[PDB]
C-alpha cells in the first residue's frame, strides 16, 4: 500500500514510510552496531556508531535517526562503513579506563563485544586518560563514571520512562559529566532499570557487586510475585544460589523493565 522499497546490501525490503535505515536492516536480519540507540527511548544520534554508507552517497548517515528513502541501497559491510565503526570505537576507548577485570560489566558489555566484532585489535593512543569523580545516586546503583561513554540513555530513561528529570549533563566537551550536579538520589520505583540500559559498567548494581560473572550464571525464566502485574523475569543462579533478578521482555506486560522491589 504505502510501503516503500529499499535495498539492504542489494536485497529488497518493503518498509513503512518513516522507517529508519536501522529498522530496515533488522528486517533482513542485520543488527547495526549501537551504543546510544534504544528502541524504547528517544533517538539521540550521539554515539555515531550506527554510521552506515548509502551507495552513491558521499557521507555516512546515522542509521538510528535517518529515515529510509525510496531506492536507497544500504551498505552495511562496505569498507567505508567498516572504517567508520573502527574510528568511532577508537575514540570511545581512548579515555576508557582499564577496568574490565574489576568491572562487573565484563562478559556482558557491549563496548567489549562491539570492539571485538567492529573494532581494531590495538591502540594508537599514546596520551593520558580522563578521570572523573564518582557520584552517589543511592544505595541501589553504583557509579563508576569514568567508564561512562556519554550515551545519555540514563538521562532519557529517567525523563521519558520514569518521569524524573534529575539526570543530566554538566559541562561541555571531554569534561562533560553525566550526573545530578547536586548530591541527589535517583530513587524511584523504576530506578534500577538504568543499570540495564547503561551499556557499560558506569552504572551497576550495588547488591550484586563482585558476586559473580555473566558466563558462570544459569538463566531461569520465571515470574515476579512482588506485585500482580506478573512481570516476566530471569533468575540468574550459580551453584544453587540466586545471584540477581533480570527483566525478561514481554511486550504486553513489563516491556523490558522491572520494579526495584522485583529487582
Amino acid at each position: 500500500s504505502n510501503l516503500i522499497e529499499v535495498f539492504v546490501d542489494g536485497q529488497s525490503v518493503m518498509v513503512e514510510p518513516g522507517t529508519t535505515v536501522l529498522q530496515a536492516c533488522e528486517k533482513v536480519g542485520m543488527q547495526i552496531p549501537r551504543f546510544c540507540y534504544h528502541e524504547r527511548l528517544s533517538v539521540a544520534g550521539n554515539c555515531r556508531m550506527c554510521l552506515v554508507e548509502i551507495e552513491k552517497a558521499p557521507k555516512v548517515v546515522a542509521a538510528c535517526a535517518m529515515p529510509v528513502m525510496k531506492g536507497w541501497n544500504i551498505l552495511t559491510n562496505s569498507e567505508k562503513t567498516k572504517k567508520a565503526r573502527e574510528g568511532v570505537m577508537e575514540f570511545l576507548l581512548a579515555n576508557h579506563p582499564l577496568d574490565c577485570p574489576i568491572c562487573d560489566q565484563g562478559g556482558e558489555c557491549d563496548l567489549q563485544d562491539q570492539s571485538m566484532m567492529f573494532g581494531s585489535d590495538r591502540s594508537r593512543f599514546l596520551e593520558g586518560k580522563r578521570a572523573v569523580e564518582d557520584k552517589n545516586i543511592g544505595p541501589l546503583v553504583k557509579t563508576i563514571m569514568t567508564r561512562c561513554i556519554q550515551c545519555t540513555r540514563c538521562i532519557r530513561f529517567a525523563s521519558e520512562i520514569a518521569g524524573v528529570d534529575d539526570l543530566g549533563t554538566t559541562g561541555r566537551g571531554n569534561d562533560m559529566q553525566v550526573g545530578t550536579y547536586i548530591e541527589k538520589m535517583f530513587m524511584s520505583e523504576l530506578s534500577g532499570n538504568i543499570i540495564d540500559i547503561c551499556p557499560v559498567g558506569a552504572l551497576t548494581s550495588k547488591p550484586y557487586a563482585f558476586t559473580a560473572r555473566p558466563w558462570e550464571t544459569r538463566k531461569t525464566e520465571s515470574i515476579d510475585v512482588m506485585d500482580a502485574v506478573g512481570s516476566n523475569i530471569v533468575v540468574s543462579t550459580r551453584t544453587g544460589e540466586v545471584m540477581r533478578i533480570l527483566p525478561r521482555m514481554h511486550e504486553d506486560i513489563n516491556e523490558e523493565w522491572i520494579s526495584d522491589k522485583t529487582r
Binding site: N46, R48, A62, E127, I149, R172
Partner: protein
C-alpha cells in the same frame, strides 16, 4: 560580456556605508543613506518577487558554508500548516579572526532590521529572533534602540511600512558558546536548552525553533537583502565571478601593518586585498609565511599560493581551503606556525559541546598530540596518525565543528610537514 579582473569597488557600489561608524547609526541618518526606502513597495510586490531577485543575485551565505541563499530561503515558501514561521538571524560571530558582524550590528543596525522584514516577508515569517553573542552587550543595546525606533515609527510592528504585514523583531543574547553559532544549536539555545546541535533531518525549514518552520541566516546575508531588492540582483551579480557573485566584508588580521575591516568585490585577489587596504604584510610580501583565509575553520595556504589566489568560494576550494567567513589571518616568517595552529585546536577543544564522540574525544586527542608536536616530543610517524585521526573526525560528526578542527590540522600537515619533522629531530638530539 566578461570581467576578467575583480576588485576596486567604488564607494557608491558599497552596501555598508557606515561600516566605520563615521555617520549617525540612528534612524534619521540611516534614512538619509537609503535604508527603509520604498520598503512598502518591496513587501507588496510579493514573496516570489523577493526570492526571485535574491536567487538572481547569486547571493551565498556569508556565515561559512556559502550555500545559495535564494534556494535556501525558498524552502520556507509553502502553505502554512497551522504552526507559526520564524526567521532567526545569526549574530553569534564566534569564528576566530572574524569580526564583520559586529560592525553591521552596531554601526548599521537598521539594515539588519529591514532585512529581517524583507527576508521574513519572503519566508512568510511572523517574527524574527536575532541571536547575538552575550559579550556583544553594547552592540546588542544599540540594536534594541534601533528596533524601538522602528517600532515607534511604524517600520516594524502591526501593519509594518503600511504593507498589512505584522512582523516583530526580538533580540536574544547568548551566554558564551561558539557552538551556538551552528544553526540547530542556536535554535536549541533559544528554546532554553544546552547549545548542542541537532541531527538533520529534520531540516530547520520543517522543524525548527519551537518545532516550527524556521530559517537561520547570517547578519551580512540579511543586511544586503533590502539593497538587493531596491538596486536589483543583477547589480549584485554585476560584481564577482559567476556563481561567486556579490560584495563581501573582509577582516584582515594578524601580522599586517593596518589590520582592518573592509568591503571589496568578491573574487578580489588576496594579495591586492592585503597590500591595498591593510598596508601589506609586516616586513613585506617576502616575509609572509602562510594565510588563513576564512577563519580558524579553514585550511591555511602558504605564500606560494597566496600570490595568485582569488578570494571567492570556488577558487579557494581549488586551493584546498575555503572562504568561510572571509576572515584573513596573516602570519609572518617570525611566527611559530605550529604553535598558532595548536592554539586553534585548543580553541575547538574548549568549544565542543561534547554531544558526539568523534569531537568529544578526537579534538582532545588532536590537542594533546599537537601540544607534543610543538615541543617535538613525538616521532615522525605520529604525523600520519594525526592525519587519520583527523579524517575519522571529518564526516562522522553531527555538526561541522569537528570538520572545522580537522581541516586546520590537515592544512599544516599538507604544507608544513618538514617543519614538524625538523622540530621532532631537534628534540631527539637534545635528549641525548
Amino acid at each position: 560580456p566578461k570581467k576578467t579582473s575583480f576588485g576596486s569597488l567604488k564607494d557608491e557600489d558599497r552596501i555598508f556605508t557606515n561600516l566605520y561608524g563615521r555617520h549617525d547609526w540612528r534612524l534619521k541618518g540611516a534614512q538619509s543613506r537609503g535604508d527603509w526606502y520604498k520598503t512598502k513597495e518591496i513587501l507588496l510586490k510579493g514573496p516570489d518577487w523577493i526570492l526571485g531577485e535574491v536567487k538572481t543575485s547569486g547571493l551565498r551565505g556569508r556565515g561559512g558554508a556559502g550555500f545559495p541563499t535564494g534556494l535556501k530561503w525558498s524552502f520556507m515558501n509553502k502553505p502554512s500548516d497551522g504552526r507559526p514561521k520564524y526567521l532567526v538571524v545569526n549574530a553569534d560571530e564566534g569564528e576566530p579572526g572574524t569580526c564583520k558582524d559586529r560592525e553591521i550590528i552596531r554601526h548599521d543596525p537598521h539594515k539588519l532590521v529591514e532585512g529581517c522584514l524583507v527576508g521574513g516577508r519572503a519566508m512568510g515569517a511572523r517574527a524574527a529572533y536575532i541571536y547575538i553573542r552575550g559579550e556583544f552587550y553594547n552592540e546588542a543595546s544599540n540594536l534594541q534602540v534601533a528596533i524601538r525606533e522602528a517600532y515607534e515609527a511604524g517600520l516594524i510592528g502591526k501593519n509594518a511600512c503600511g504593507s498589512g504585514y505584522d512582523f516583530d523583531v526580538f533580540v536574544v543574547r547568548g551566554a558564551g558558546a561558539y557552538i551556538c553559532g551552528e544553526e540547530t544549536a542556536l535554535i536549541e539555545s533559544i528554546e532554553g536548552k544546552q547549545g548542542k546541535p541537532r541531527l538533520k533531518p529534520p531540516f530547520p525549514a520543517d522543524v525548527g525553533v519551537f518545532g516550527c518552520p524556521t530559517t537561520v541566516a547570517n547578519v551580512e546575508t540579511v543586511a544586503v537583502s533590502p539593497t538587493i531588492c531596491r538596486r536589483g540582483g543583477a547589480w549584485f551579480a554585476s560584481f564577482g565571478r559567476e556563481r561567486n557573485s556579490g560584495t563581501k566584508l573582509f577582516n584582515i588580521s594578524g601580522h599586517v601593518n593596518n589590520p582592518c575591516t573592509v568591503e571589496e568585490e568578491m573574487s578580489v585577489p588576496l594579495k591586492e586585498l592585503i597590500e591595498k587596504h591593510a598596508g601589506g604584510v609586516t616586513g613585506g610580501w617576502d616575509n609572509l609565511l602562510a594565510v588563513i583565509p576564512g577563519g580558524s575553520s579553514t585550511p591555511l595556504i602558504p605564500k606560494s599560493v597566496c600570490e595568485t589566489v582569488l578570494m571567492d568560494f570556488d577558487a579557494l576550494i581549488q586551493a584546498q581551503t575555503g572562504l568561510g567567513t572571509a576572515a584573513v589571518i596573516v602570519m609572518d616568517r617570525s611566527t611559530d606556525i605550529v604553535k598558532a595552529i595548536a592554539r586553534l585546536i585548543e580553541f575547538y577543544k574548549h568549544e565542543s559541546c561534547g554531544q558526539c564522540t568523534p569531537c568529544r574525544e578526537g579534538v582532545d586527542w588532536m590537542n594533546k598530540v599537537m601540544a607534543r608536536f610543538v615541543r617535538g616530543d613525538a616521532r615522525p610517524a605520529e604525523i600520519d596518525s594525526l592525519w587519520e585521526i583527523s579524517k575519522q573526525i571529518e564526516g562522522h560528526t553531527i555538526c561541522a565543528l569537528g570538520d572545522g578542527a580537522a581541516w586546520p590540522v590537515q592544512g599544516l600537515i599538507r604544507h608544513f610537514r618538514p617543519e614538524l619533522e625538523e622540530r621532532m629531530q631537534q628534540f631527539a638530539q637534545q635528549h641525548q
